[PDB]
Design a protein around this nucleic acid. Structure first.
Ligand SMILES: [Mg+2]
Ligand SMILES: [Zn+2]
Ligand SMILES: [Zn+2]
Lengths: 447, 99, 100, 1337, 28
DNA sequence: GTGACTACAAAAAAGC
RNA sequence: GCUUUUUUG
DNA sequence: TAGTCAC
């Protein structure tokens, strides 16, 4: 039906609904439109535009696999019922679940798209959960991938990250989505904006998809409003169809919500991104991903403000699910005396938190939680009380803070090498811990 | 990752792979080209013969190096002979016409 | 909806019709912690109710009886952890959304 | 042990000689035991002993009966490795056809009989009958037959009727028939033949048979009747658990075929009827087919779980085939891999090593070292003590390291500088420590790339490593000309800071007694590093032959320059370092020393440069700070006006006065202008920032901005980066390639709008995607380049040839962008140099032009010379040294043996990474105008107008030097004359970008020979306001009217068709299509007056297509003949075009398109090799009509121009040598040795003719024509069959090599690699020559 | 110790004969 | 014009 | 062990 | 998938 609606929209139809099958008149209109295009009536489409690109999350993928298993068992059971017992049979024995179970299990556990999670860094795992791939069973091969799909469509602004992108044979195919971008129930990409009536910004938010971006004009967040939308000058920059120009104040009607919805969550932690080249931004984001935790993380001297949100939103850290005050603290478990109003009648228990300790990751790095609170102090519902790996006080922290001097020195920093004092290694500010796993089996042969 | 001598694969009489399970360093062919480009010939001969695929020489050199000798075996590679046999297997008359 | 796509099942000429009725999800057999401890999928069972209706042979659409097999064991389905991920055997994996 | 290989078919008797017995049963094992049968397939009696020095029964035990047979088991009591090679044979009851000649697409059997193979298969499997002259009057020997017809002929003749069956009958036929009368009859037929489709078939057949009769093989032997059996060691049969075996596919097919033989034997043992004889014979036929090649004809595996099995091809063909992977690309021991870092304290011939890698690599040498000293007793004791890290291990290892160089290479070994050698210096850590300077060769940044360490073993390898792969020896560029030890990234800034001049500082104006105490002043901190002091130094000059005379004087300089003079070596003038030294200069510096002092002084000079550069860069200190770079205030203000002006253009577009496209051009141009203005402003601000007063008044000087040193010294960055950092970032283009109209007004230091940032992203993503995708296609290119140029080993010094033409500096229209002096540098002269002084010879011939004669040319104004070229070297499968040139690896001439092809391929392919994938003439210099192809006539204005379309003008220096060169398009008026001394900035020729056609004789224009309206259309256009003449074509005008090729009749005052007097023709000029003439009728037109006016890629693809010589879309057609051109007719398609040569082949025409412009007319006196149309040209015609040397300068021009566009230089020797191998084939014009026209080796034909001429004097031999071939096709058609069998279609090459008796001489390189024998390129080449000279000589 | 063979190159120069003769001398 | 035959690394995992 | 697939540089 | 010679 989404395909049906897209088809009807492409043919300038009037309906939204439709059948799951074609009909003669539809193909007839297809020839008519193609011939008119050949004559020069209308214009060709563009696959790179987001309106023609859709995201299939876990939902419809699992639905597809489950339906395939369903029909696979259904043909057999229907045939057996037709040719078999009539009244002295139970549905349970004739029905089967092993083929469907095996199919969904293999789809979940082994696929070109079922990725393997990275655990080395909370930022790494968050940006891996946000990943979007044009690969896998339904995408396209590297050999047959055109050059244009590597490139950046002018409508990517605000939906997919123009920076976070791996380097190698597959570049521009694995870009992740921006921070504010949220999916639309039809599967398109939608981002927030702010309506403007004449010259005053509507505080209410307004979600906008890719296609409706075409017929509107949208300004930039850096535009300065006096007190209620009064722009600094009535001639301001804007954008209508992938182009920039100076437009009148009444010309524009939408505001972008903020400045961050252009960049990804992974790349929004780089401070002062406004001054370096795009390529260095790419590399910086990648080495941000590939960080490894230290034994005692330290707060970043210069940050971007998303540290709190990225730490709390990812579940690696332990957060106070229910408000109250702390009753007992331990290095391993946390007891929280819930507030009398926070609890609901009947269930009068108090909060328990069994923190994890050093356990193997998917990259042999170490995960633990040192409790970062004390006794007899307030806590709030949905507040951090335990800090996991590479974080502190609910703020992200991946490396350390060094004192640095930009100075050529006897060639030991000839091209890109680094000089390190004995002091940094002596106080152990970078020394990490890794966990290895060894497994031994016991088979039985003839001897 | 470093390797001197140890186990070899069953399928081919060559050292193992990867850092784990006692592997060895890979020698491509771009650098074969480059070694060709120099006057370097003896090193290429020795490496293709005794370092990787030889079994008789592999132990022979190892016994040769321990007693202070580093002299090769000035003869045709053994794999050439069996290779020759294969062409002689079909119907083909092949021989070293000039000795 | 996936059931509704295969909701009506009818014989060839046996006048026996199998239809979906209801579904519910059982509780996970093991919690996540032991799932990575032992190496099993953090899964949940599928329980479904099926109704079989049979008419008199060579007679109009008048059923004889309703065979109700409820809560049918319908395989196992992985449950997403609250963190937003799965575990296949003992290792944590995520499904990246595909763009097509 | 040998130096050549011959391959051919085998005879049954010598096949048995190969064998050592006859095998009877497939019994490879007996149950209840594990002993192969002495009469089975794994016959130890014929394969050899099962256990070392032991017979099958073991009655002889390893001391008393070694090497002798046993009485019980008929096997010699010897070692078991003979079993690895000992082999037998099987005798076939009935002969069978070797199916490869069956299964090859150019089937040898069918080509030999010229009769199809489909019936051959039928008769082979006994489905059709073959006659053997069944009747003397009805049919022939080679007709198929049916049993029903066989019965009919039996009743018909019977007595003379005889017709056997199958492969035995075919072999009887082949043996009965000869090939001599075949060869003479085919020679007679092809001599008098007209058919072309069968001509090629017949030529191939006659060639095959005439080679076969000379080969000596027998066709009957081709139909094998005895089959050899392989030694059992090759087929893996391990006894599995429960008495099972590995079931080698070889054993499956052996058992199958031997069972078929046994069944046929039993069938023939009772005189069985022929009804079952056919069945068993056919089945044995498929059995032998499956064994020899299964899956090709019947696909009858029948020995596996429905899967293909290794019969024979899997051991030859397929990636599992061990040839091209198991001798090309594999693992190796005695090697390690690790990360690299910077060792800025090491001499240039050293490298570091972590201790763990050291001990792991050398522990075999360690055991020998310990046991020789006797400290260890057993091998286990040595292993355990070295594992326990004793005290003696460290110093003994340090002893054994001292002379044992190791090899280092980055992963993508792009060229010969990829792999080097060093002496290890053991250190602590876990990373490889490299010299900084050599790090420029590997292109190995320190971003964490890994390098691999190898180690040679034998004394020969170690000595060769010391002699060749020391970093010292490999200094100059193998690519073109320069040291690869150019001072590296950091040292250059240190040198620049060393040598500056501040207007005033501490310690200025005094004098210093020398460089010795000069640093004393600086070290005490009493004088500035740079000052204005006066010091006296003593140097030497190489003016004395072998002596360095010392001279001294007082020279004004700075303190730092004295510090540098402290370490500069002896024989160099002081003026070379008097200037503010930069990156390019210091590089040149090294070159000078390398051309004066040698090698060791240069290398110690390089090490001193490194040490001083690092020391005084660290001591100096130069960071980058926010206030270090400064933005000009004017910039914003400046671009403000630009912004304003943009709005102005908008209003012109707002008014509708202008369209967007011209508005688009206007805005992009004004933005570019504003960018230029602001960039100039900020350069101006930075360059002269420093204004320091000296003794009162303030006075400016060169700036001391840290960025300004860091860039102006050229260590890093360029003008573009510095412009980006402060000024206008510029305007980027939208991804389709067109430039977006809004430049990014802000710079990096200031803020950025996110949209500006967003816009700039895809510009970077485009380039990054290009760099990502380039690493595959470019590398593969080099592969195609190496296979064609694989061998090309120089073999003899001089063949005495003296060919080549005029190696001259190409002038590129404007200023010439390369001189002669570098172009001929390193090339050896072919002809004697005649100084332009009336036979006052300056350089004798056969002399190397290194520098001295090169230094003798500039003062002699020599501007045109020729040198020997490898294309003009007529040896046999080699190159002459005095025809090759000077190898760039070492300053001396190329030695004997050093491979050239591989070096050339690598040098050509290395810059692929930097190789991206996607009206009038105004003189500018002073000289006298010079015109080539002078065809001009005085116009009505008294000046000169050309009438030759290929006219070309040049400007010559007053010293005889060419300075300019310009094409003169047809019908361009000349505002000057030849030889008139005119300075620059003066136009001399004028024309239009539509083209004019102009008369040659004066008089009226009596417009006859055209039909008004039909031929010429009197288009009275409103714009011109007159009834002009339009000579439309046949399709444009009326076809019936346009059936005479109208020509205007220019007449004199007498109204007559005036002729060029007696010489050529009347004034009739064939007016072409759309010949727009503005005259109406009968207006006087002088000679040379207008008649009409016709209204007329990426680097990597360019290189790749040029090396393939693939034809372009529009081949600019050429007049391959002389004479006077005419015009043909019009056909259903493109217009015919006939020519009228003044002699020779008068009736010549061609199929010429008419839609595209044809700047050719009747009055064109065509000559030998002049282009007809315009545009791209294929190499084929240029080669086949205007000589080989024409292309030689063509491909080199194109590729070197491309690389120069990319700013990369490679010496012209490398690019053209592959041409000498690219141009490796030819066709035969006149017969006498070959048949008529086969394309074969040109060098082979030349050597055949040259020897023939003295032997059979007077014979024409074979006049030929040297054609070209794509490098891919050149690889396919290589003479060496082994090279072909390496990587493609192994089946055929074996077939037509064996039947034709191919004898490979191993003249190549890859063939020597494939068989495992030593390569005869480097020290191997000396080895073989020494082996040949001593042994068998 | 020794690293440069420029003397041999300039007197008996051939990168192969000298290394081969050194090899056969050192084989003893 | 169309058809048979032919050709740079480390790590995670499936299928025998 | 081998074949293949994936992630990372 | 991209390249080759034959019917
Ligand atoms: Mg590195
Ligand atoms: Zn015996
Ligand atoms: Zn020569």
């Amino acid at each position: 039906a989404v395909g049906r609606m897209k088809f009807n929209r492409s043919l300038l139809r009037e309906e939204i609904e439709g059948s799951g099958i074609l009909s003669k008149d539809d193909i007839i209109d297809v020839m008519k439109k193609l011939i008119d295009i050949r004559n020069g009536k209308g214009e060709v489409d563009d696959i790179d535009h987001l309106g023609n690109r859709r995201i299939r999350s876990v939902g419809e993928m699992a639905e597809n696999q489950f339906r395939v298993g369903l029909v696979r068992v259904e043909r057999a059971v229907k045939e057996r019922l037709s040719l078999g017992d009539l009244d002295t049979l139970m549905p349970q024995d004739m029905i089967n679940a092993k083929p469907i179970s095996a199919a969904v299990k293999e789809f979940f556990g082994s696929s070109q798209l079922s990725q393997f999670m990275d655990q080395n860094n909370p930022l790494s795992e968050i940006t891996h959960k946000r990943r979007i791939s044009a690969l896998g069973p339904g995408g396209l091969t590297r050999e047959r991938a055109g050059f244009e799909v590597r490139d950046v469509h002018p409508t990517h602004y605000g939906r997919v990250c123009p920076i976070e992108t791996p380097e190698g044979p597959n570049i521009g195919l694995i870009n992740s989505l921006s921070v504010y971008a949220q999916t639309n129930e039809y599967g398109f990409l939608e981002t927030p904006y702010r309506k403007v009536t004449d010259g005053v910004v509507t505080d209410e938010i307004h979600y906008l998809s890719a296609i409706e971006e075409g017929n509107y004009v949208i300004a930039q967040a850096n535009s300065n409003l006096d007190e209620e939308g009064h722009f600094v000058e009535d001639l301001v920059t804007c954008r209508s169809k992938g182009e920039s120009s100076l437009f009148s104040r009444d010309q524009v009607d939408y505001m972008d919500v903020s400045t961050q919805q252009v960049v990804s969550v992974g790349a929004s932690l780089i401070p002062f991104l406004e001054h370096d080249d795009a390529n260095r931004a790419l590399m910086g984001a990648n080495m941000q991903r590939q960080a490894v935790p230290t034994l005692r993380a330290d707060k970043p001297l210069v940050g971007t403000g998303m540290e709190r949100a990225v730490a709390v939103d990812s579940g690696v850290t332990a957060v106070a699910k229910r408000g109250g005050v702390v009753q007992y603290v331990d290095a391993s478990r946390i007891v929280i005396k819930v507030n009398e109003d926070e609890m609901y009648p009947g269930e009068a228990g108090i909060d328990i938190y069994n923190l994890t300790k050093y356990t193997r990751s998917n990259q042999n790095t170490c995960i633990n939680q040192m409790p970062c609170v004390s006794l007899g102090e307030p806590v709030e519902r949905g507040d951090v009380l335990a800090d996991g790996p590479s974080t502190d006080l609910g703020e992200l922290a991946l490396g350390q803070n060094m004192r640095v001097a930009f100075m050529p020195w006897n060639g030991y920093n000839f091209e890109d090498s680094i000089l390190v004092s004995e002091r940094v290694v002596q106080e152990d500010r970078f020394t990490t811990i890794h966990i290895q796993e060894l497994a031994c089996v016991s088979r039985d042969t003839k001897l | 990752h470093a390797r001197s001598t140890g186990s070899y694969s069953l399928v081919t009489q060559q050292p193992l792979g990867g850092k784990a399970q006692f592997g060895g360093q890979r020698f491509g062919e771009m650098e074969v080209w480059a070694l060709e480009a120099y006057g370097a010939a003896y090193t290429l001969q020795e490496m293709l013969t005794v370092k990787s695929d030889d079994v008789n020489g592999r132990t022979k050199m190892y016994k040769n190096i321990v007693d202070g000798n580093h002299q090769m075996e000035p003869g045709m590679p053994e794999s050439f002979n069996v290779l020759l046999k294969e062409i002689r297997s079909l119907g083909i008359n092949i021989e070293l016409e000039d000795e | 909806a996936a059931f509704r796509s295969v909701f009506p099942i009818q014989s060839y000429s046996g006048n026996s019709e199998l239809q979906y009725v209801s579904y519910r999800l059982g509780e996970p057999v093991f919690d996540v912690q032991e799932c990575q401890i032992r190496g099993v999928t953090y899964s949940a069972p599928l329980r479904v109710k099926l109704r079989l209706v049979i008419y008199e042979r060579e007679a109009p659409e008048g059923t004889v009886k309703d065979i109700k097999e409820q809560e049918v064991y319908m395989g196992e389905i992985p449950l997403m952890t609250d963190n937003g991920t799965f575990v296949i055997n003992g290792t944590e994996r995520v499904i990246v959304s595909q763009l097509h | 042990e040998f130096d050549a290989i011959k391959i051919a078919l085998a005879s049954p008797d010598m096949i048995r000689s190969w064998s050592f017995g006859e095998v009877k049963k497939p019994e490879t094992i007996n149950y209840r035991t594990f002993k192969p049968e002495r009469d089975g397939l794994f016959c130890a009696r014929i394969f050899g002993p099962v256990k070392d020095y032991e017979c099958l029964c073991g009655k002889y035990k390893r001391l008393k009966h070694r090497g002798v047979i046993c009485e019980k088991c008929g096997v010699e009591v010897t070692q078991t490795k003979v079993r690895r090679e000992r082999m037998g044979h099987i005798e076939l009851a009935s002969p069978t056809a070797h199916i490869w000649f069956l299964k090859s697409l150019p089937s040898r059997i069918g080509l030999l009989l010229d009769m199809p193979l489909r019936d051959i298969e039928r008769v082979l499997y006994f489905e059709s009958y073959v006659v053997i002259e069944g009747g003397m009057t009805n049919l022939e020997r080679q007709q198929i037959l049916t049993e029903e017809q066989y019965l009919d002929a039996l009743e018909e003749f019977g007595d003379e009727f005889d017709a056997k069956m199958g492969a035995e009958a075919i072999q009887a036929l082949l043996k009965s028939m000869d090939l001599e009368q075949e060869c003479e009859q085919l020679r007679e037929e092809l001599n008098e033949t007209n058919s072309e489709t069968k001509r090629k078939k017949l030529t191939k057949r006659i060639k095959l048979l005439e080679a076969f009769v000379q080969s000596g093989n027998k066709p009957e032997w081709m139909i094998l009747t005895v089959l050899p059996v392989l030694p059992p060691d090759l087929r893996p049969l391990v006894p599995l658990d429960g008495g099972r075996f590995a079931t080698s596919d070889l054993n499956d097919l052996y058992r199958r075929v031997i069972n078929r033989n046994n069944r046929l034997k039993r069938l023939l043992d009772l005189a069985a009827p022929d009804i079952i004889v056919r069945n068993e014979k056919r089945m044995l036929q498929e059995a032998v087919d499956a064994l020899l090649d299964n899956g090709r004809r019947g696909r009858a595996i029948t020995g596996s779980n429905k899967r293909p099995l290794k019969s024979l091809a899997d051991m030859i063909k397929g990636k599992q085939g061990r040839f091209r992977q198991n001798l090309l690309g594999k693992r190796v021991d005695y090697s390690g891999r690790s990360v690299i870092t910077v060792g800025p304290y090491l001499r240039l011939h050293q490298c570091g090593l972590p201790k763990k890698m050291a001990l792991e690599l050398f522990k075999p040498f360690i055991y020998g070292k310990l046991e020789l000293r006797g400290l260890a007793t057993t091998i286990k004791a040595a292993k355990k003590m070295v594992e326990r890290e004793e005290a003696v291990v460290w110093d003994i290892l340090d002893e054994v390291i001292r002379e044992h160089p190791v090899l280092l290479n980055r992963a993508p070994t792009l060229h010969r500088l990829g792999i080097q050698a060093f002496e290890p210096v053991l250190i602590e850590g876990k990373a490889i420590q490299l010299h900084p300077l050599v790090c420029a060769a590997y292109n190995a940044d320190f971003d964490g790339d890994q390098m691999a360490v190898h180690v040679p073993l034998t004394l020969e390898a170690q000595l060769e490593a010391r002699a060749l792969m020391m970093s010292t020896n490999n200094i100059l560029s193998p690519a073109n000309g320069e040291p690869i030890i150019v001072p590296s990234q950091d040292v250059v800034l240190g040198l620049y800071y060393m040598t500056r001049d501040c207007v005033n500082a501490k310690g200025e104006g005094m004098v210093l007694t020398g460089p010795k105490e000069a640093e004393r002043l600086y070290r005490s901190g009493l004088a500035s590093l740079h000052a204005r002091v006066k010091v006296r130094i003593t140097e030497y000059e190489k003016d004395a032959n072998g002596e360095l005379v010392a001279k001294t004087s007082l020279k004004d300089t700075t303190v730092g320059r004295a510090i540098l003079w402290m370490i500069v070596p002896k024989g160099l003038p002081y003026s070379i370092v008097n200037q503010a030294l930069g990156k390019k200069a210091i590089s040149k510096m090294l070159n000078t020393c390398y051309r004066i002092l040698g090698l060791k002084p240069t290398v110690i000079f390089a090490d001193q440069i490194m040490y001083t550069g690092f020391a005084y860069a660290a001591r100096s200190g130069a960071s980058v700070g926010i206030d270090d770079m400064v933005i000009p205030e004017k910039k914003h203000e400046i671009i403000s006006e630009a912004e304003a002006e943009v709005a102005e253009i908008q209003e012109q577009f707002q008014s509708g006065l202008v369209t967007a496209g011209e508005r688009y051009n206007k805005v992009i141009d004004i933005w570019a202008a504003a960018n230029d203005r602001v960039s100039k402003a900020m350069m101006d601000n930075l360059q002269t920032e420093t204004v320091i007063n000296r003794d009162g008044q303030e006075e400016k000087q060169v700036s001391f901005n840290s960025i300004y040193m860091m860039a102006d010294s050229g260590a890093r960055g360029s003008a573009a980066q510095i412009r980006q950092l402060a000024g206008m970032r510029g305007l980027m283009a939208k991804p389709d390639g067109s430039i977006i109209e809004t430049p990014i007004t802000a710079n990096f230091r200031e803020g950025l709008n996110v949209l500006q940032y967003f816009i700039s992203t895809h510009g970077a993503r485009k380039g990054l995607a290009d760099t990502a995708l380039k690493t595959a296609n470019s590398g593969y290119l080099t592969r195609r380049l190496v296979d064609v140029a694989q061998d090309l080993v120089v073999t003899e010094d001089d063949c005495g040839t003296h060919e080549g033409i005029m190696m001259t500096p190409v002038i590129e229209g404007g200023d010439v962008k390369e001189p002669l002096r570098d172009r001929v540098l390193g090339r050896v002269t072919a002809e004697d140099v005649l100084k332009p002084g009336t036979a006052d010879i300056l350089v004798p011939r056969n002399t190397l032009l290194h520098e001295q004669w090169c230094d003798l040319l500039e003062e002699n104004s020599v501007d045109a010379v020729k040198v020997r070229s490898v294309v003009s070297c007529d040896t046999d499968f080699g190159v002459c040294a005095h025809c090759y040139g000077r190898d760039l690896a070492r300053g001396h001439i190329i030695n004997k043996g050093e491979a050239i092809g591989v070096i050339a391929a690598q040098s050509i392919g290395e810059p692929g990474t930097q190789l991206t994938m996607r009206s009038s003439i105004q003189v500018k210099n002073k000289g006298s105008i010079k015109l080539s192809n002078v065809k001009s006539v005085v116009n009505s204005s008294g000046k000169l107008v050309i009438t030759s379309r290929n006219t070309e003008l040049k400007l010559i220096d007053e010293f005889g030097r060419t300075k300019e060169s310009y094409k003169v398009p047809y019908g361009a008026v000349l505002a000057k004359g030849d030889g008139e001394q005119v300075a620059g900035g003066e136009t001399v020729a004028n024309w239009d970008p539509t083209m004019p056609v102009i008369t040659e004789v004066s008089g009226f224009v009596r417009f006859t020979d055209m039909i008004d309206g039909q031929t010429i259309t009197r288009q009275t256009d409103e714009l011109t306001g007159l009834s002009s003449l339009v000579v439309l074509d046949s399709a444009e005008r009326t076809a019936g009217g346009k059936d005479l090729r109208p020509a205007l009749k220019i007449v004199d005052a007498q109204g007559n068709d005036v002729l060029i007097p007696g010489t050529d023709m009347p004034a009739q000029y064939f007016l072409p299509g759309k010949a727009i003439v503005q005259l109406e009728d009968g207006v006087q037109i002088s000679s040379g007056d207008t008649l009409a006016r016709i209204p007329q890629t990426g680097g990597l693809p360019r290189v790749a297509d040029l090396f393939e010589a693939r034809r372009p879309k529009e081949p600019a057609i050429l007049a391959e003949i002389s004479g006077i051109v005419s015009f043909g007719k019009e056909t259903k398609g493109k217009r015919r075009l006939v020519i009228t040569p003044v002699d020779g082949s008068d009736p010549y025409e061609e199929m010429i398109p008419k839609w595209r412009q044809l700047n050719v007319f009747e009055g064109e006196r065509v000559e030998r090799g002049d282009v007809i149309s315009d545009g791209p040209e294929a190499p084929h015609d240029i080669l086949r009509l205007r000589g080989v040397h024409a292309v030689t300068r063509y491909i080199v021009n194109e590729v070197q121009d491309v690389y120069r566009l990319q700013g990369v230089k490679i010496n012209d020797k490398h690019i053209e040598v592959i041409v000498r191998q690219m141009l490796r084939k030819a066709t035969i014009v006149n017969a006498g040795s070959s048949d008529f026209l086969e394309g074969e080796q040109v060098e082979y034909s030349r050597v055949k003719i040259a020897n023939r001429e003295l032997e059979a004097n007077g014979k024409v031999g074979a006049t030929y024509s040297r054609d070209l071939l794509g490098i891919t096709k050149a690889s396919l058609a290589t003479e060496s069959f082994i090279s072909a069998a390496s990587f493609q279609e192994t089946t055929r090459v074996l077939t037509e090599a064996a039947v034709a008796g191919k004898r490979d001489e191993l003249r190549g390189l890859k063939e020597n690699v494939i068989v495992g024998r030593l390569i005869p390129a480097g020290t191997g080449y000396a080895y073989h020559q020494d082996r040949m000279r001593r042994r068998a000589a | 110790a020794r690293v440069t063979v420029q003397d041999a190159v300039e007197k008996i120069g051939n990168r192969f004969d000298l290394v081969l003769v050194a090899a056969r001398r050192a084989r003893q």
